[PDB]
Design an enzyme around this catalytic site. Structure first.
Site, PDB file in Angstrom:
ATOM      1  N   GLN A  64       8.641  -6.455  -0.140  1.00 18.58           N
ATOM      2  CA  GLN A  64       7.698  -6.021  -1.147  1.00 18.58           C
ATOM      3  C   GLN A  64       6.266  -6.366  -0.683  1.00 18.58           C
ATOM      4  OE1 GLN A  64       7.767  -8.319  -4.825  1.00 18.58           O
ATOM      5  NE2 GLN A  64       7.215  -6.477  -5.993  1.00 18.58           N
ATOM      6  N   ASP A 104       5.778  -3.858   1.823  1.00 15.56           N
ATOM      7  CA  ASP A 104       5.707  -2.579   1.164  1.00 15.56           C
ATOM      8  C   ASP A 104       4.305  -2.407   0.650  1.00 15.56           C
ATOM      9  OD1 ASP A 104       5.735  -0.855  -1.324  1.00 15.56           O
ATOM     10  OD2 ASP A 104       7.695  -0.424  -0.738  1.00 15.56           O
ATOM     11  N   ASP A 141       1.539  -3.750   1.655  1.00 17.64           N
ATOM     12  CA  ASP A 141       0.504  -3.666   2.637  1.00 17.64           C
ATOM     13  C   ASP A 141       0.443  -2.195   2.957  1.00 17.64           C
ATOM     14  OD1 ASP A 141      -0.990  -3.606   5.109  1.00 17.64           O
ATOM     15  OD2 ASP A 141      -0.549  -5.737   5.329  1.00 17.64           O
ATOM     16  N   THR A 198      -4.076   1.114   2.849  1.00 14.53           N
ATOM     17  CA  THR A 198      -4.138   1.659   4.194  1.00 14.53           C
ATOM     18  C   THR A 198      -2.750   1.676   4.824  1.00 14.53           C
ATOM     19  OG1 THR A 198      -4.819  -0.454   5.340  1.00 14.53           O
ATOM     20  CG2 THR A 198      -6.552   0.897   4.400  1.00 14.53           C
ATOM     21  N   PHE A 225      -1.738   1.459   7.828  1.00 12.31           N
ATOM     22  CA  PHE A 225      -1.513   0.489   8.903  1.00 12.31           C
ATOM     23  C   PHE A 225      -1.037  -0.851   8.358  1.00 12.31           C
ATOM     24  CE2 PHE A 225      -5.084   3.326  10.092  1.00 12.31           C
ATOM     25  CZ  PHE A 225      -4.458   4.023  11.110  1.00 12.31           C
ATOM     26  N   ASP A 239      -2.094  -3.805   8.330  1.00 12.43           N
ATOM     27  CA  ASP A 239      -3.309  -4.591   8.513  1.00 12.43           C
ATOM     28  C   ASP A 239      -3.725  -5.628   7.500  1.00 12.43           C
ATOM     29  OD1 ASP A 239      -4.465  -3.226   6.314  1.00 12.43           O
ATOM     30  OD2 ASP A 239      -4.935  -1.515   7.597  1.00 12.43           O
ATOM     31  N   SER A 242      -4.097  -5.343   4.396  1.00  9.20           N
ATOM     32  CA  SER A 242      -4.958  -4.743   3.368  1.00  9.20           C
ATOM     33  C   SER A 242      -4.463  -5.066   1.947  1.00  9.20           C
ATOM     34  CB  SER A 242      -5.042  -3.224   3.536  1.00  9.20           C
ATOM     35  OG  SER A 242      -3.920  -2.594   2.951  1.00  9.20           O
ATOM     36  N   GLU A 302       2.958  -9.115  -9.836  1.00 10.97           N
ATOM     37  CA  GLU A 302       3.930  -8.421 -10.665  1.00 10.97           C
ATOM     38  C   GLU A 302       5.052  -9.385 -11.009  1.00 10.97           C
ATOM     39  OE1 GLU A 302       6.858  -7.815  -8.757  1.00 10.97           O
ATOM     40  OE2 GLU A 302       8.094  -6.506 -10.015  1.00 10.97           O
ATOM     41  N   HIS A 308      14.487  -3.066  -4.137  1.00 10.52           N
ATOM     42  CA  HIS A 308      14.869  -3.364  -5.518  1.00 10.52           C
ATOM     43  C   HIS A 308      16.302  -3.883  -5.674  1.00 10.52           C
ATOM     44  CE1 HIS A 308      11.523  -0.458  -7.118  1.00 10.52           C
ATOM     45  NE2 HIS A 308      11.038  -1.590  -6.641  1.00 10.52           N
TER      46      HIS A 308
HETATM   47  C1  HEM Z   1       9.512  -6.433 -10.103  1.00 12.19           C
HETATM   48  C2  HEM Z   1       9.689  -5.838  -8.715  1.00 12.19           C
HETATM   49  C3  HEM Z   1      10.210  -6.429  -7.589  1.00 12.19           C
HETATM   50  C4  HEM Z   1      10.850  -7.713  -7.351  1.00 12.19           C
HETATM   51  C5  HEM Z   1      11.186  -8.555  -8.310  1.00 12.19           C
HETATM   52  C6  HEM Z   1      10.113  -5.410  -6.521  1.00 12.19           C
HETATM   53  C7  HEM Z   1      10.569  -5.649  -5.226  1.00 12.19           C
HETATM   54  C8  HEM Z   1      10.417  -4.776  -4.170  1.00 12.19           C
HETATM   55  C9  HEM Z   1      10.808  -4.978  -2.823  1.00 12.19           C
HETATM   56  C10 HEM Z   1      11.484  -6.206  -2.278  1.00 12.19           C
HETATM   57  C11 HEM Z   1      10.433  -3.847  -2.114  1.00 12.19           C
HETATM   58  C12 HEM Z   1      10.600  -3.488  -0.700  1.00 12.19           C
HETATM   59  C13 HEM Z   1      11.356  -4.208   0.126  1.00 12.19           C
HETATM   60  C14 HEM Z   1       9.836  -3.007  -3.053  1.00 12.19           C
HETATM   61  C15 HEM Z   1       9.322  -1.837  -2.730  1.00 12.19           C
HETATM   62  C16 HEM Z   1       8.745  -1.020  -3.638  1.00 12.19           C
HETATM   63  N1  HEM Z   1       8.650  -1.155  -4.969  1.00 12.19           N
HETATM   64 FE1  HEM Z   1       9.131  -2.636  -5.977  1.00 12.19          FE
HETATM   65  N2  HEM Z   1       9.570  -4.325  -7.049  1.00 12.19           N
HETATM   66  C17 HEM Z   1       9.255  -4.534  -8.308  1.00 12.19           C
HETATM   67  C18 HEM Z   1       8.666  -3.622  -9.162  1.00 12.19           C
HETATM   68  C19 HEM Z   1       8.229  -2.375  -8.807  1.00 12.19           C
HETATM   69  C20 HEM Z   1       7.613  -1.448  -9.693  1.00 12.19           C
HETATM   70  C21 HEM Z   1       7.338  -1.615 -11.181  1.00 12.19           C
HETATM   71  C22 HEM Z   1       7.329  -0.340  -8.986  1.00 12.19           C
HETATM   72  C23 HEM Z   1       6.644   0.898  -9.526  1.00 12.19           C
HETATM   73  C24 HEM Z   1       7.493   2.170  -9.386  1.00 12.19           C
HETATM   74  C25 HEM Z   1       6.898   3.376 -10.087  1.00 12.19           C
HETATM   75  O1  HEM Z   1       7.032   4.571  -9.683  1.00 12.19           O
HETATM   76  O2  HEM Z   1       6.233   3.198 -11.117  1.00 12.19           O
HETATM   77  C26 HEM Z   1       7.787  -0.603  -7.671  1.00 12.19           C
HETATM   78  C27 HEM Z   1       7.620   0.231  -6.640  1.00 12.19           C
HETATM   79  C28 HEM Z   1       7.978  -0.100  -5.370  1.00 12.19           C
HETATM   80  C29 HEM Z   1       7.690   0.808  -4.234  1.00 12.19           C
HETATM   81  C30 HEM Z   1       6.931   2.101  -4.313  1.00 12.19           C
HETATM   82  C31 HEM Z   1       5.527   1.662  -3.810  1.00 12.19           C
HETATM   83  C32 HEM Z   1       4.491   2.745  -3.900  1.00 12.19           C
HETATM   84  O3  HEM Z   1       4.437   3.539  -2.952  1.00 12.19           O
HETATM   85  O4  HEM Z   1       3.661   2.874  -4.832  1.00 12.19           O
HETATM   86  C33 HEM Z   1       8.156   0.202  -3.131  1.00 12.19           C
HETATM   87  C34 HEM Z   1       8.135   0.642  -1.670  1.00 12.19           C
HETATM   88  N3  HEM Z   1       8.333  -1.829  -7.579  1.00 12.19           N
HETATM   89  N4  HEM Z   1       9.833  -3.569  -4.283  1.00 12.19           N
HETATM   90  C1  LIG Z   2       4.655   2.923  -7.328  1.00 13.61           C
HETATM   91  C2  LIG Z   2       3.806   1.651  -7.397  1.00 13.61           C
HETATM   92  C3  LIG Z   2       4.291   0.561  -6.452  1.00 13.61           C
HETATM   93  C4  LIG Z   2       4.567  -0.853  -6.903  1.00 13.61           C
HETATM   94  C5  LIG Z   2       4.039  -1.465  -8.038  1.00 13.61           C
HETATM   95  C6  LIG Z   2       4.377  -2.801  -8.300  1.00 13.61           C
HETATM   96  O1  LIG Z   2       3.879  -3.422  -9.396  1.00 13.61           O
HETATM   97  N1  LIG Z   2       5.203  -3.493  -7.474  1.00 13.61           N
HETATM   98  C7  LIG Z   2       5.715  -2.874  -6.399  1.00 13.61           C
HETATM   99  S1  LIG Z   2       6.746  -3.724  -5.335  1.00 13.61           S
HETATM  100  N2  LIG Z   2       5.390  -1.591  -6.106  1.00 13.61           N
HETATM  101 CA   LIG Z   3      -2.492  -1.541   4.913  1.00 18.35          CA
END
Ligand code: HEM
Ligand SMILES: CCCc1cc(=O)[nH]c(=S)[nH]1
Ligand SMILES: [Ca+2]
Ligand SMILES: *[C@@H]1O[C@H](CO)[C@@H](O[C@@H]2O[C@H](CO)[C@@H](O)[C@H](O)[C@H]2NC(C)=O)[C@H](O)[C@H]1NC(C)=O
Ligand SMILES: *[C@@H]1O[C@H](CO)[C@@H](O)[C@H](O)[C@H]1NC(C)=O
Ligand SMILES: *[C@@H]1O[C@H](CO)[C@@H](O)[C@H](O)[C@H]1NC(C)=O
EC number: 1.11.1.7
Length: 595
Positions: A105, A108, A110, A184, A186, A188, A190, A258, A351
């Site tokens: 996460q 993710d 970054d 970004t 990359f 990096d 960010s 979060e 998730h």
């Molecule tokens: C609470 C949440 C987490 C842990 C307790 C959690 C965990 C992860 C991990 C470990 C990820 C990758 C290995 C990961 C990726 C992405 N998440 Fe997630 N995540 C929690 C909560 C959220 C929520 C809320 C969102 C929003 C989803 C939406 O459409 O509203 C969420 C997203 C993502 C996501 C998409 C990122 C993006 O491009 O905006 C991951 C790649 N996570 N999470």
């Molecule tokens: C789609 C938004 C991405 C996102 C939001 C958030 O609050 N947590 C995680 S891991 N990802």
């Molecule tokens: Ca970045």
């Protein structure tokens, strides 16, 4: 291929090029095509978008238009019928630490973010979405199917807004709508320094030429620092505990807080920055605060990149690693380092690794406090627990000692997430991430499961006897087909995660391929990748090859005992060893002899 682009990305920027530093926005990584990989621009489309109107309309939105001859099943129903599970007994990964889940996460964040749209504030239009659940424009509610318990407790839908997109904020015609990626592409850091200069600046400490990042005033971790507080209100962090009245953290990524553990690592990463900025001034006391800033920022970056490619991904990917990520061979400019739109759905296999509880372990890794072990659902946007109770150390031990939740078809996402998720502005701990993930695939216009099987050059099953074979799971298939008439309509997220995990990794063959190229594209296409000559010295690279999460913790907390392999599930006190036995980052190679 139509046109050369769409509006709403900053028209003109500069590239110093002689600057051996990354911009904040990610511009100027690539001389051929500047904006590549840069923040607040469109996610990349590896395959054409798919919508009921082929333009800006998600599938299911209509209530008549069916997809491929069938209506799409409600997100909340596949979540309940295939994703949900009660019994937490036996769901822990015997060889993946909680840290393992907690770096994905971090990585993710970054790499990407789809800015979720709520638009205006003075809004009853928001009331229309949640209270009445009115479909329309960018609100796109997840209705509950019948026999849905939440039904009796939270009206008939979970509000859900669509994701930001290029050109207008309203939908348009004559081109497929693309979602925006605010960070970004990359790797990096960010998520620590920001992706907008405005932010990057207010994030820094400019009141001392020490190149430090800003830190909190109102509190400390018995010596250590805490990120500054996000000053704006409302604050979901205050909401959870109005009595406590403790706000969320100021950090690069806006999602920093979060869940408690995420802000935990965010804290360790921020400390790591100053920690360096301090030593870089010890050895190179003739530099400007700007240089301290950019050198530390540079260093913190390769670290992230090392942990991620060296220790993390080879176990997420397993046997399909050296297939998609064969050892480094140079910075290929002809590579698109942009993050794919379908990657942002593919990385949330993360998730299904999140476990229901989170513990705070004492200095002898026994339960710290009487409420030592806490429910994960009480930890969304929870900063008061860190501050007013324990600090970072307790939680960092649980990160090292506790397991992650192994993915398992009959037990996919924990209720802390499936039923009790929390969301800013919403007052209830009653959200379904699984459903949101699904409503999300549509919202972006994702092609279906088989378009992604095929694109990854994998067998795209047509039938029920055809599907069973591929997941190796009889009734998961049946269930899927019942819910999703044909494998082609199965929304990708669950489609990808529904496959068993590949040899030595934790993701099915499809995600293996989807992730493989995306990580191969973030490196190969990074002009500032730490291994490409120019960006670092052999003397410096040498030093960087020694880092470790273990060390990260040792340098920025008061922990003493750690495991050499922070991710391979480690048990105490057997697997643990003292900080001294853990290699350090020699800062000698950066020092400059002024003469
Ligand atoms: C609470 C949440 C987490 C842990 C307790 C959690 C965990 C992860 C991990 C470990 C990820 C990758 C290995 C990961 C990726 C992405 N998440 Fe997630 N995540 C929690 C909560 C959220 C929520 C809320 C969102 C929003 C989803 C939406 O459409 O509203 C969420 C997203 C993502 C996501 C998409 C990122 C993006 O491009 O905006 C991951 C790649 N996570 N999470
Ligand atoms: C789609 C938004 C991405 C996102 C939001 C958030 O609050 N947590 C995680 S891991 N990802
Ligand atoms: Ca970045
Ligand atoms: C809200 O936050 C407040 C502020 O810390 C919490 O109050 C404390 O909670 C535990 C009780 O087991 C101990 O820290 C103290 O006994 C409490 N102190 C105060 C000031 O009451 C409270 O636990 C939190 N409650 C909620 C609503 O989450
Ligand atoms: C900025 O650095 C100075 C010099 O050490 C320090 O006194 C101050 O607390 C720092 N401010 C922030 C917000 O980090
Ligand atoms: C966990 O995985 C690693 C792979 O590097 C292995 O060497 C380690 O011995 C494993 N240990 C356990 C407890 O499975």
């Amino acid at each position: 291929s139509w046109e050369v682009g769409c509006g709403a990305p900053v028209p003109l920027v500069t590239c110093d090029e002689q600057s051996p530093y990354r911009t904040i926005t990610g511009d100027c990584n690539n001389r051929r095509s500047p904006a590549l990989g840069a923040a607040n621009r469109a996610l990349a489309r590896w395959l054409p978008a798919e919508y009921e109107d082929g333009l800006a309309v998600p599938f299911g939105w209509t209530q008549r238009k069916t997809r491929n001859g069938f209506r799409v099943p409600l997100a909340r129903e596949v979540s309940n019928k295939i994703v949900g599970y009660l019994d937490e007994e036996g769901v822990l990964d015997q060889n993946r630490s909680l840290l393992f889940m907690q770096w994905g996460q971090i990585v993710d964040h970054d790499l990407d973010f789809a800015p979720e749209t709520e638009l205006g504030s003075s809004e009853h239009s928001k009331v229309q979405c949640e209270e009445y659940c009115v479909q329309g424009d960018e609100c796109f509610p997840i209705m509950f199917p019948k026999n849905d318990p939440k039904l009796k407790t939270q009206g008939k839908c979970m509000p859900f807004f669509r994701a930001g997109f290029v050109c207008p904020t309203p939908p348009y015609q004559s081109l497929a709508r693309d979602q925006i990626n605010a960070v970004t592409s990359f790797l990096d850091a960010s998520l620590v320094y920001g992706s907008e200069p405005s932010l990057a600046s207010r994030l820094r400490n400019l009141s001392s030429p020490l190149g430090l990042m800003a830190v909190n005033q109102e509190a400390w971790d018995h010596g250590l620092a805490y990120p500054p507080f996000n000053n704006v209100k409302p604050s979901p962090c205050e909401f959870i505990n109005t009595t406590a009245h403790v706000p969320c953290f100021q950090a690069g990524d806006s999602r920093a807080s979060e869940q408690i553990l995420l802000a935990t690592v965010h804290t360790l990463l921020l400390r790591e920055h100053n920690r360096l900025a301090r030593e870089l001034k010890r050895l190179n006391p003739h530099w400007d605060g700007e240089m301290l800033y950019q050198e530390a920022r540079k260093i913190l970056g390769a670290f992230i990149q090392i942990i991620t490619f060296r220790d993390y991904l080879p176990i997420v990917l397993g046997s399909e690693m050296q297939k998609w990520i064969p050892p480094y061979q140079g910075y290929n400019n002809s590579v698109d380092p942009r993050i794919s739109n379908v990657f942002t759905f593919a990385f949330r296999f993360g998730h299904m690794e999140v476990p229901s509880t989170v513990s705070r372990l004492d200095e002898n890794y026994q339960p710290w406090g009487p409420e030592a072990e806490l429910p994960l659902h009480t930890l969304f946007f929870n900063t008061w627990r860190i501050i007013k109770d324990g600090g970072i150390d307790p939680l960092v031990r649980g990160l090292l000692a506790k397991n992650s939740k192994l993915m398992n078809q009959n037990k996919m996402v924990t209720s802390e997430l499936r039923n009790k998720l929390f969301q800013p502005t919403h007052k209830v701990h009653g959200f379904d991430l699984a459903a949101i993930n699904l409503q999300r695939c549509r919202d972006h216009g994702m092609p279906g499961y088989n378009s992604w099987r095929g694109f990854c050059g994998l067998s795209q099953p047509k039938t029920l006897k055809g599907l069973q074979a591929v997941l190796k799971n009889k009734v998961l298939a049946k269930k899927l087909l019942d819910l999703y008439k044909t494998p082609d309509n199965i929304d990708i997220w669950i489609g990808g995660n529904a496959e068993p995990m590949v040899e030595r990794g934790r993701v099915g063959p499809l995600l293996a391929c989807l992730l493989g190229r995306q990580f191969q594209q973030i490196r190969d296409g990074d002009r500032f990748w730490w291994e490409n000559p120019g960006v670092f010295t052999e003397k410096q690279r040498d030093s960087l090859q020694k880092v470790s999460f273990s060390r990260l913790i040792c340098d920025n907390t008061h922990i003493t005992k750690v495991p050499l392999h922070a991710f391979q599930a480690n048990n105490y006190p057997h697997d643990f060893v003292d900080c001294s036995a853990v290699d350090k980052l020699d800062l000698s190679p950066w020092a400059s002899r002024e003469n």
